[PDB]
CSV table of C-alpha atoms and ligand atoms in Angstrom, one decimal:
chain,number,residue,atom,x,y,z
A,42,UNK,CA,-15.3,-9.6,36.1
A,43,UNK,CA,-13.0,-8.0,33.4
A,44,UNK,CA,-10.0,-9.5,34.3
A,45,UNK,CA,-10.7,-12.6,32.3
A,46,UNK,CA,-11.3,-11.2,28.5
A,47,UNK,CA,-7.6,-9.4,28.8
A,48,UNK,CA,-6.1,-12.7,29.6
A,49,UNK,CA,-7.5,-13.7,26.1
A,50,UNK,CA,-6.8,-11.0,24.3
A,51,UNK,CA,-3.5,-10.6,25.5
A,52,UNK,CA,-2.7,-14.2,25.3
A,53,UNK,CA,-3.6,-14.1,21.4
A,54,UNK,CA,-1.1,-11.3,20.4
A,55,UNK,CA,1.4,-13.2,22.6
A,56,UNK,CA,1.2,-16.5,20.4
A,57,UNK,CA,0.2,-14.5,17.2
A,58,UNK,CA,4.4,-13.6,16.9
A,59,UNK,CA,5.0,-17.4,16.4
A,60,UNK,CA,1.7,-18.0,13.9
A,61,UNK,CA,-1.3,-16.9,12.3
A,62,UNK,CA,-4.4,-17.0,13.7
A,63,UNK,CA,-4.8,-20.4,11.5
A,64,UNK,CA,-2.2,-22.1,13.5
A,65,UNK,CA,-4.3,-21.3,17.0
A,66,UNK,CA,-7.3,-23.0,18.4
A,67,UNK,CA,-9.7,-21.6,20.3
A,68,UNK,CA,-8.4,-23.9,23.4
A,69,UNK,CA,-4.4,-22.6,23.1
A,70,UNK,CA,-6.4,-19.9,24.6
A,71,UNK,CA,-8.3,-21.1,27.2
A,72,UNK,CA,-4.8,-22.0,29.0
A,73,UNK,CA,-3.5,-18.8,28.3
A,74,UNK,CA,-6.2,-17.1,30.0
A,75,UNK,CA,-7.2,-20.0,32.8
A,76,UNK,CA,-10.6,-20.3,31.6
A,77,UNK,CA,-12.3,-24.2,30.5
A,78,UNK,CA,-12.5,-24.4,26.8
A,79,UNK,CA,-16.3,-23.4,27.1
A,80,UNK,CA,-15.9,-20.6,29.1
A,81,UNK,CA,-14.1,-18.6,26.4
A,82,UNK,CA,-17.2,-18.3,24.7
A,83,UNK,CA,-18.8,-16.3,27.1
A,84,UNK,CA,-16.4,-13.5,25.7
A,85,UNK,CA,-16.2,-14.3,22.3
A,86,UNK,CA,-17.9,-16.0,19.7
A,87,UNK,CA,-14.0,-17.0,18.1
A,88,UNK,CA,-10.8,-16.6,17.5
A,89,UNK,CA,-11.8,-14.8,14.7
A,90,UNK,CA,-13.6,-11.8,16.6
A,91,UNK,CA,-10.6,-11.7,19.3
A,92,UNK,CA,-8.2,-10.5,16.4
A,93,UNK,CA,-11.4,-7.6,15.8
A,94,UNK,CA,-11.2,-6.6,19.8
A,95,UNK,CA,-7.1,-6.7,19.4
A,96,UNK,CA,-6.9,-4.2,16.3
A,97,UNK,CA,-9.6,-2.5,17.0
A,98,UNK,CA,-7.5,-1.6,20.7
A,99,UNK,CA,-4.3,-1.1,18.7
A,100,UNK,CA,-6.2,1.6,16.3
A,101,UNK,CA,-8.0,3.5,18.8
A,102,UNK,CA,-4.2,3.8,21.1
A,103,UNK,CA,-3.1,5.4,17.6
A,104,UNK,CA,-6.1,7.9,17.7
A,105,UNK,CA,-5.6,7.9,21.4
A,106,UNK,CA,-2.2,8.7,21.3
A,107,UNK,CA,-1.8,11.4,18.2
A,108,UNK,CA,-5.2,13.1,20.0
A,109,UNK,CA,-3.2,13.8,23.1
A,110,UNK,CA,-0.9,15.9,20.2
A,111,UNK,CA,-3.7,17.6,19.6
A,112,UNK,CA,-4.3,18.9,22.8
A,113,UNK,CA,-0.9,20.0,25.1
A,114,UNK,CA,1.6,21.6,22.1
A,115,UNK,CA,5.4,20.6,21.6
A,116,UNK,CA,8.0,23.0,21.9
A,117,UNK,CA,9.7,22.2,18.5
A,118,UNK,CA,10.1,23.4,15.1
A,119,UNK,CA,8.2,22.4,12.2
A,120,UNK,CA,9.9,19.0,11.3
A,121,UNK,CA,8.9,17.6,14.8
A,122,UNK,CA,5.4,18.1,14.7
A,123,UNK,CA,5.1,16.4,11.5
A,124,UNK,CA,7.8,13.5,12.5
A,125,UNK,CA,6.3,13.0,16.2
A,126,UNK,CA,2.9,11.9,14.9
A,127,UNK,CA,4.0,9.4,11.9
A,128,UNK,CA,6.1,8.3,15.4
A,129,UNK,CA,3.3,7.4,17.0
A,130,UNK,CA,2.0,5.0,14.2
A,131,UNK,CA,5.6,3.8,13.7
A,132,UNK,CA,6.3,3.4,17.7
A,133,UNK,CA,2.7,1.9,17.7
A,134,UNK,CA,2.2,-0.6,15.3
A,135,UNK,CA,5.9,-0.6,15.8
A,136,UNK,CA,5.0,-2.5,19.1
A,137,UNK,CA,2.2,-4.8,18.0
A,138,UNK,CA,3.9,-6.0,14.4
A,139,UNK,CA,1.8,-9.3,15.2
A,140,UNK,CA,-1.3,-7.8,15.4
A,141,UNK,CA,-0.9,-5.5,12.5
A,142,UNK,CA,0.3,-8.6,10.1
A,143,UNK,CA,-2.5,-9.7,11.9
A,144,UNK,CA,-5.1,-7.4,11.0
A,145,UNK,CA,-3.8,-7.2,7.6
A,146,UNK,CA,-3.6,-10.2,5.8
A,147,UNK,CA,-7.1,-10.4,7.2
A,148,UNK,CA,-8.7,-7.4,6.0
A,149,UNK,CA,-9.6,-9.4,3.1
A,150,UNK,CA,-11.9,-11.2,4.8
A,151,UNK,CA,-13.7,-9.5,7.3
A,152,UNK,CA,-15.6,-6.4,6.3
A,153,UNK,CA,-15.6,-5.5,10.1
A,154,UNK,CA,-11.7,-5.4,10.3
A,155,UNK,CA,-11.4,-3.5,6.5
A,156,UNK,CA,-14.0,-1.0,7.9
A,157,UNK,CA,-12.5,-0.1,10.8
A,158,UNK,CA,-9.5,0.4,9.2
A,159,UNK,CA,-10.9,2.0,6.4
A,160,UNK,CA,-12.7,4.5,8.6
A,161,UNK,CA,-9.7,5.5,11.3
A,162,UNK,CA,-8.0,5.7,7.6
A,163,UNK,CA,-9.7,8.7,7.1
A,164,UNK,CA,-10.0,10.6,10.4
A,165,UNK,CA,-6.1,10.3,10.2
A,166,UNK,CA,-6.5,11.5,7.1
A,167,UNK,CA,-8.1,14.3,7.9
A,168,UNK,CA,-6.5,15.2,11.1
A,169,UNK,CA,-3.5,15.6,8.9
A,170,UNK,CA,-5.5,17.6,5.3
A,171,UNK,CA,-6.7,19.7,8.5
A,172,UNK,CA,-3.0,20.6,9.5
A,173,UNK,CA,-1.7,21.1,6.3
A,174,UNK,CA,-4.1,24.0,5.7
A,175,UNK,CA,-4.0,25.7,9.7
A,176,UNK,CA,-0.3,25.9,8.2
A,177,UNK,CA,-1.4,28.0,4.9
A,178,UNK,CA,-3.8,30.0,6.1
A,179,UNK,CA,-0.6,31.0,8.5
A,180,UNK,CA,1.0,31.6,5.7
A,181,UNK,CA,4.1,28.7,6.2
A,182,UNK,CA,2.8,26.3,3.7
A,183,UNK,CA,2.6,27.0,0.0
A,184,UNK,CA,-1.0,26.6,-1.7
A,185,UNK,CA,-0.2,24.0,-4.2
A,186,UNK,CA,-2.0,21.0,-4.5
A,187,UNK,CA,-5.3,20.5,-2.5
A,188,UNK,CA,-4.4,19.3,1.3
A,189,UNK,CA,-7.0,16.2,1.6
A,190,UNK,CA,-5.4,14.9,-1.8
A,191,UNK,CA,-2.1,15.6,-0.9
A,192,UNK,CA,-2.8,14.4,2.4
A,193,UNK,CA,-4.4,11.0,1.1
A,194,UNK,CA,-1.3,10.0,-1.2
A,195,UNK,CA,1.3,10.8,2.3
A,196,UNK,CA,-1.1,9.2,4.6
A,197,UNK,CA,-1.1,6.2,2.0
A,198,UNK,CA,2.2,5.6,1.7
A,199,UNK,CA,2.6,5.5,5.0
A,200,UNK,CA,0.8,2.6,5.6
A,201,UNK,CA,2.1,0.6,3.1
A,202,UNK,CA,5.5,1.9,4.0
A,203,UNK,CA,5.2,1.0,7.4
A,204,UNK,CA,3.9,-2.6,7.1
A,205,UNK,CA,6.4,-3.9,4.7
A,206,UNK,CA,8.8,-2.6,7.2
A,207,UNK,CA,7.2,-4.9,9.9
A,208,UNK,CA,6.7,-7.8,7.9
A,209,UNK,CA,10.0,-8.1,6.2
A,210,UNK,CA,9.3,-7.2,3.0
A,211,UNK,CA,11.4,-7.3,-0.1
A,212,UNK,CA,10.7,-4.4,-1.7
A,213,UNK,CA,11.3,-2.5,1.9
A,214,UNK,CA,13.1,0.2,3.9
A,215,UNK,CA,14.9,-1.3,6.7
A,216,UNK,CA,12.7,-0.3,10.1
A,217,UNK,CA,15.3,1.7,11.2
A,218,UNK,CA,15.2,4.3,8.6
A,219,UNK,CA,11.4,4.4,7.2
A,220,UNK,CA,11.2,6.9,9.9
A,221,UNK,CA,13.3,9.5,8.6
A,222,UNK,CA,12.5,8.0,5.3
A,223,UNK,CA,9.1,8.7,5.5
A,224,UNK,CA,9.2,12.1,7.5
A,225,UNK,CA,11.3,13.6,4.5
A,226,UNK,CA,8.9,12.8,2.2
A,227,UNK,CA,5.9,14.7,4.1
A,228,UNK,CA,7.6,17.8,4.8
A,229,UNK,CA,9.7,18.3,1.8
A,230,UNK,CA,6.2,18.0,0.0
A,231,UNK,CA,3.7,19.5,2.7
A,232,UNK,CA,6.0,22.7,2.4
A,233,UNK,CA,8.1,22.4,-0.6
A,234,UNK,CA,7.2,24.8,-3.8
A,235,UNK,CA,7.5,23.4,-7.4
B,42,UNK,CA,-0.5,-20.8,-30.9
B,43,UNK,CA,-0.6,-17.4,-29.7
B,44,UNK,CA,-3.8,-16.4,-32.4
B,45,UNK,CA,-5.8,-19.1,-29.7
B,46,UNK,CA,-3.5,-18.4,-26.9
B,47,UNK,CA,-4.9,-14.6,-27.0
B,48,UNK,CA,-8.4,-15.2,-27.6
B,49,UNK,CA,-8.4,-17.0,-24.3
B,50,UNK,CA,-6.6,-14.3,-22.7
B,51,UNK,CA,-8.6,-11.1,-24.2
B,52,UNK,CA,-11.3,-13.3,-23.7
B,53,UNK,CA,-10.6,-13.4,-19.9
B,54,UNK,CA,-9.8,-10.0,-19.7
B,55,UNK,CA,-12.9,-8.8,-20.9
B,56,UNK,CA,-14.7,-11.0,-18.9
B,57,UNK,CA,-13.0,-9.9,-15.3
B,58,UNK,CA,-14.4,-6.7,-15.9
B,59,UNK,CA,-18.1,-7.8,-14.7
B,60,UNK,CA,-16.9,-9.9,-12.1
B,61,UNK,CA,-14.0,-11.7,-10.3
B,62,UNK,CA,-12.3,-15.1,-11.5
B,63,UNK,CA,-14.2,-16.9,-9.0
B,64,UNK,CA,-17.0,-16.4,-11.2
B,65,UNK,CA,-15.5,-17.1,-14.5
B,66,UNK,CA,-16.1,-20.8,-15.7
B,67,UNK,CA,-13.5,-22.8,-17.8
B,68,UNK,CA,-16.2,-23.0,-20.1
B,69,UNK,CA,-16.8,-19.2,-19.9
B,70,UNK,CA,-13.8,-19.1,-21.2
B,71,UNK,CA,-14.0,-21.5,-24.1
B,72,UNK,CA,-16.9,-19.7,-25.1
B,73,UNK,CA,-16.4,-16.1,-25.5
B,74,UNK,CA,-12.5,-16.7,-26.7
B,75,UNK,CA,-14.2,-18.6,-29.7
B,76,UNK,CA,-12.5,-21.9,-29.0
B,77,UNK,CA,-12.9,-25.6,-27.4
B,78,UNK,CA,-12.7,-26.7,-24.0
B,79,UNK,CA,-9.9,-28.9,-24.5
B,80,UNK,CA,-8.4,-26.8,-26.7
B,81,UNK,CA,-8.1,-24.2,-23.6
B,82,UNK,CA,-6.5,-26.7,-21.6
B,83,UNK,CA,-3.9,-27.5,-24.4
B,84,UNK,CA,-2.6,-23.9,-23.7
B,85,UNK,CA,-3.9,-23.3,-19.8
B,86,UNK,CA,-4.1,-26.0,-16.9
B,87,UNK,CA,-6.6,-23.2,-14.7
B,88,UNK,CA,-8.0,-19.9,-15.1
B,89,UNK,CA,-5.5,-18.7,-12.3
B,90,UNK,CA,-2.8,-19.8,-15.1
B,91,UNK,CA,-4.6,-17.2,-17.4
B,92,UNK,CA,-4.9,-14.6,-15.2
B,93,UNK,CA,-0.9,-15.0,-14.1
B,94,UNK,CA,-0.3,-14.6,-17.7
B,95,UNK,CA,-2.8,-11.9,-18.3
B,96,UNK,CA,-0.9,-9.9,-15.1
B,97,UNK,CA,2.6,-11.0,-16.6
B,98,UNK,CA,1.8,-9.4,-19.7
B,99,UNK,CA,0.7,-6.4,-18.2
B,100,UNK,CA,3.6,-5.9,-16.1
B,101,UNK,CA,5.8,-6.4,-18.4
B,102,UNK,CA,3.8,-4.2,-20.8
B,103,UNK,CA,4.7,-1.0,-18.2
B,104,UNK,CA,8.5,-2.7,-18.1
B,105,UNK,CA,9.3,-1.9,-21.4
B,106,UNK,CA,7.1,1.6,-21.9
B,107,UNK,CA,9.4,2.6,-19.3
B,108,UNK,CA,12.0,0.8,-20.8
B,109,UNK,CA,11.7,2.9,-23.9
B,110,UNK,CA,12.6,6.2,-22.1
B,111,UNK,CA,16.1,5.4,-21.9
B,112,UNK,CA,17.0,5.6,-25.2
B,113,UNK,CA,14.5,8.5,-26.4
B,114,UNK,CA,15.7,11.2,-23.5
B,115,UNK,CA,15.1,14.1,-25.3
B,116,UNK,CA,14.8,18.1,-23.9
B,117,UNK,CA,13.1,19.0,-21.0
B,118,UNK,CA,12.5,20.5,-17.5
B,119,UNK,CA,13.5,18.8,-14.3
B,120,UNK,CA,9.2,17.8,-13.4
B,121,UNK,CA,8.5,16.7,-16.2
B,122,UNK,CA,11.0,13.8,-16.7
B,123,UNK,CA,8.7,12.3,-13.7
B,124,UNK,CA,5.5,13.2,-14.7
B,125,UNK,CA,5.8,10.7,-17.9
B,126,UNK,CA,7.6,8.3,-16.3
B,127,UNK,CA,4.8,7.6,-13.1
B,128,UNK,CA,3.2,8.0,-16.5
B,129,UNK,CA,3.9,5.1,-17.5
B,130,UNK,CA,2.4,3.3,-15.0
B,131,UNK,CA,-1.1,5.2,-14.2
B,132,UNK,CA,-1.8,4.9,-18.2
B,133,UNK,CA,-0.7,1.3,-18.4
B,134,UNK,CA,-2.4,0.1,-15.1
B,135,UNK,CA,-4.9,2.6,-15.7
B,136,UNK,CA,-5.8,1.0,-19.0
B,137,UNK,CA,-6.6,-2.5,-17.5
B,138,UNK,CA,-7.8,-1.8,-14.0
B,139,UNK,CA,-9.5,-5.3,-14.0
B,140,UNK,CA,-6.7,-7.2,-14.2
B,141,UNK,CA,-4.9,-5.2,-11.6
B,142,UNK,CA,-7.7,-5.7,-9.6
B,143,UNK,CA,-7.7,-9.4,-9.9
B,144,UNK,CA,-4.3,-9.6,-9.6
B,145,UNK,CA,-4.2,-8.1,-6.9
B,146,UNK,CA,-6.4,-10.2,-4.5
B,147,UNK,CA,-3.8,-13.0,-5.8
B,148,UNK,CA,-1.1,-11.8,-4.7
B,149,UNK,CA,-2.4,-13.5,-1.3
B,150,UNK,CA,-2.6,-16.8,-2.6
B,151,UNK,CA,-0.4,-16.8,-5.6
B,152,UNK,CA,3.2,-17.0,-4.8
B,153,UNK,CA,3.7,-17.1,-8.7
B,154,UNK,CA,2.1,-13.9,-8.6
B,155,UNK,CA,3.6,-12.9,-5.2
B,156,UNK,CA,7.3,-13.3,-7.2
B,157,UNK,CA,5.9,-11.8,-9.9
B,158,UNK,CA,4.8,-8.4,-8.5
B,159,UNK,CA,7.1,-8.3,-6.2
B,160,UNK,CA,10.6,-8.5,-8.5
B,161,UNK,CA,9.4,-6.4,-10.7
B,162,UNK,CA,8.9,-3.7,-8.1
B,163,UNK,CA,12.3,-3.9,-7.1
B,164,UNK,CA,13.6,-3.7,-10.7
B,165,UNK,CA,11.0,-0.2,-11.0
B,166,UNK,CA,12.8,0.9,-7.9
B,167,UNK,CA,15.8,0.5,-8.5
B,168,UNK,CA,15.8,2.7,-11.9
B,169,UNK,CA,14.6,5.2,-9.8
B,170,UNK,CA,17.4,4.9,-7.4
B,171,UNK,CA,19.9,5.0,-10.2
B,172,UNK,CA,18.1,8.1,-11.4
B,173,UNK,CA,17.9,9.5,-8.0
B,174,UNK,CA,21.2,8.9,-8.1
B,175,UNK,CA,23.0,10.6,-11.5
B,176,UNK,CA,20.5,13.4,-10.9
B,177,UNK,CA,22.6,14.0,-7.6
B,178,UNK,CA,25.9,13.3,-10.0
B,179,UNK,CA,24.8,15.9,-12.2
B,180,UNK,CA,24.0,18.6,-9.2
B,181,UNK,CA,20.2,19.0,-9.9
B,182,UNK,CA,19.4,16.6,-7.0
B,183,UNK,CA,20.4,17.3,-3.4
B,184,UNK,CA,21.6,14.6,-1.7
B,185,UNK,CA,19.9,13.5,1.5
B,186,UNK,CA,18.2,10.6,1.6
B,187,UNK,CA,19.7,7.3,0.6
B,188,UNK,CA,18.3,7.1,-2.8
B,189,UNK,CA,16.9,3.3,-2.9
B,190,UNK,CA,15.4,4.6,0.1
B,191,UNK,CA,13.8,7.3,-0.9
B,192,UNK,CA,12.9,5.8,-4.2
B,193,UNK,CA,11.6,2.6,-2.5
B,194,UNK,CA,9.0,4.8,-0.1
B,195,UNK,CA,7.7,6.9,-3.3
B,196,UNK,CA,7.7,3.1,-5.1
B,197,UNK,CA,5.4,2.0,-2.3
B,198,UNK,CA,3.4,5.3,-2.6
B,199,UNK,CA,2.6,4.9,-6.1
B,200,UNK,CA,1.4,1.0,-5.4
B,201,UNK,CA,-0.9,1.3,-2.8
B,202,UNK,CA,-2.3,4.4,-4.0
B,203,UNK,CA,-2.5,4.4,-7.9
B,204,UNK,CA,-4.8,0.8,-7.1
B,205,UNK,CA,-6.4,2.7,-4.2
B,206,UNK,CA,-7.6,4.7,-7.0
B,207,UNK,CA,-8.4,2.7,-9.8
B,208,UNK,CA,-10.1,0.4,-7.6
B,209,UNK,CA,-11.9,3.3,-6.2
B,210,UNK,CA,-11.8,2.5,-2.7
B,211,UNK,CA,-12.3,4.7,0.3
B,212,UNK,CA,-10.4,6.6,1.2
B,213,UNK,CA,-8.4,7.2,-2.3
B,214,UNK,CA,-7.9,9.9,-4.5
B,215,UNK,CA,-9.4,10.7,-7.7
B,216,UNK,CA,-8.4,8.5,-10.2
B,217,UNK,CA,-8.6,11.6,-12.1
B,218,UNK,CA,-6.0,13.9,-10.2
B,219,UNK,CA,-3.6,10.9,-8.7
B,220,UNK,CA,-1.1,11.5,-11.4
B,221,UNK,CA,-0.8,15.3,-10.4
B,222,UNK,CA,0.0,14.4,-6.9
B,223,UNK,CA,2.3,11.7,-7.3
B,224,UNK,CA,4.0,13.3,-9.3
B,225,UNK,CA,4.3,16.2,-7.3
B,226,UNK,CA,5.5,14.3,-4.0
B,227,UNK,CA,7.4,12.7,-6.2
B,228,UNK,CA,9.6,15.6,-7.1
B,229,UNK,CA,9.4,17.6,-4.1
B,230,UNK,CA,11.2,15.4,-2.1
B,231,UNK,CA,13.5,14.0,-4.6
B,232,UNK,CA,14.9,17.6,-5.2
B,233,UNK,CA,13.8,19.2,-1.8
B,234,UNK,CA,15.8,20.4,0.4
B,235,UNK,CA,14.0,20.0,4.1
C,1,CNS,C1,0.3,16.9,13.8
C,1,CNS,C2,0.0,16.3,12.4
C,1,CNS,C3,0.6,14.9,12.1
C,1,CNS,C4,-0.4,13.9,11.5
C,1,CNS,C5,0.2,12.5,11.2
C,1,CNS,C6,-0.7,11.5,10.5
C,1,CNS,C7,0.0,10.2,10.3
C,1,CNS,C8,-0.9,8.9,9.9
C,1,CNS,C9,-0.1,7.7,9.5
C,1,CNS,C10,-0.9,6.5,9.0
C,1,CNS,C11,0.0,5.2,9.1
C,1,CNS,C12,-0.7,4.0,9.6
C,1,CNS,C13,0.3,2.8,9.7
C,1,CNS,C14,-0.2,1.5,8.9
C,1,CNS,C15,0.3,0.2,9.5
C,1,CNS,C16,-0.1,-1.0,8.7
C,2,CNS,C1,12.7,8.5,-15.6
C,2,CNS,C2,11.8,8.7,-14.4
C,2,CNS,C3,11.6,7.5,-13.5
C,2,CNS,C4,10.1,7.1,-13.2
C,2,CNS,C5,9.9,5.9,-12.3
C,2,CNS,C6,8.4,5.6,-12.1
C,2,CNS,C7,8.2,4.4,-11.1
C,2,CNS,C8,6.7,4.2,-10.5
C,2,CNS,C9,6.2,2.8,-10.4
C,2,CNS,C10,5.1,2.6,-9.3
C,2,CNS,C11,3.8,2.2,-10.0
C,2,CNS,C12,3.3,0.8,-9.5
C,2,CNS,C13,1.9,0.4,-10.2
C,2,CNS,C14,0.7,0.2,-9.3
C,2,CNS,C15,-0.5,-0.5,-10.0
C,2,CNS,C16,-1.7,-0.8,-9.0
């Protein structure tokens, strides 16, 4: 019987914009879901390792998504198949700010959240280094500084970027530019020269 | 004062580099600084106290290094200019990793240190708006991006990166090339074109 454990998680994220996880007890959810208090744990241990199953489904959408980009191309020019895949993590997390404040100001204290985050971290990360050098070996992209570094410091930024757009910040860049913000940055420097 | 009130401090410092605060005693303190436990408290009420001064003082340390670049400009090539002023930061930073380290998993529970961090870092993004900004005036800079903008993004970069470094996480970049590719980004999309 699935059903039951989306009702959970879905009820979390739902409460989790007026909250943090602190703020919730593991029976707000068991209305939410239309489960007795003890019947939850048949599904999770707590509250704690819901907010795991809800990141851990808004990472892999990410991978899920920008992998479909891997496979069918986009009829576009350069700019747009660099912008389109920073979209998906904006338009993503974009959705679920919750869950990525979330996930965040939680990563320092649970090695199983700062893993999987530090380990999607770096297959984005490559994904991208990977890109950058399929567009040298073409000849479009200048041989400057090595791809996984460069890509590391863009792929960085983003994130940090990203969330302080989401949370509201202050230093930020209103969430309606750190889009075209952030695409600038990636291609002037993926490509530029000097 | 201060001859005691640095002791402690030094004393702290020197003593966050084998482990975190939560390990360091009051009495820890006393010790290794050279003076009594009361006489601690006379200057500090908590270690946290020391360690907000010890960040304050490195922070404002980087404030005025960059500080002092305004009035010694001297001659030299677009690059450059940058590479001495994210300078600045990597050497200073770079010079007490321990602290930033420790300040860092404060900024979570500190809201002195929260403040702290965080006006500053508007303050270091805004002088590189204003330079952004008369580089544009003086026709070396094209103008695209709205230069708070764009220096806020590269001002997040250099955050979260730099410490991703000097904390040598995973995934990071070299501690020992991070200033060649900050700076480049940097530049590239500061002057670039698109
Ligand atoms: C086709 C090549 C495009 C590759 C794009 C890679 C983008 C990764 C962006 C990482 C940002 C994560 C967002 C963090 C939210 C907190
Ligand atoms: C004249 C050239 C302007 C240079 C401006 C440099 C600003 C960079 C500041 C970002 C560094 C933050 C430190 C992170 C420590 C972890």
């Amino acid at each position: 019987g699935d059903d039951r454990e989306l009702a959970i998680l879905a009820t979390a994220e739902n409460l989790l914009e007026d909250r943090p996880l602190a703020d919730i007890s593991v029976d707000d959810l068991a209305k939410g879901a239309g489960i007795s208090r003890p019947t939850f744990y048949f599904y999770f241990p707590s509250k704690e390792a819901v907010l795991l199953t809800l990141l851990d489904r808004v990472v892999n959408q990410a991978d899920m998504a920008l992998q479909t980009l891997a496979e069918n191309p986009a009829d576009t020019d350069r700019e747009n198949m660099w912008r389109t895949g920073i979209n998906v993590f904006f338009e993503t997390f974009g959705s679920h700010k919750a869950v990525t404040r979330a996930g965040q100001a939680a990563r320092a204290t649970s090695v199983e959240v700062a893993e999987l985050w530090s380990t999607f971290m770096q297959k984005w990360i490559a994904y991208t280094a990977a890109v950058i050098d399929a567009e040298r070996d073409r000849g479009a992209a200048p041989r400057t500084l090595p791809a996984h570094e460069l890509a590391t410091a863009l792929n960085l930024m983003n994130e940090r970027t990203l969330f302080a757009s989401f949370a509201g910040e202050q230093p930020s860049v209103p969430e309606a530019r750190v889009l075209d913000t952030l695409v600038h940055i990636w291609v002037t420097s993926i490509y530029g020269e000097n």
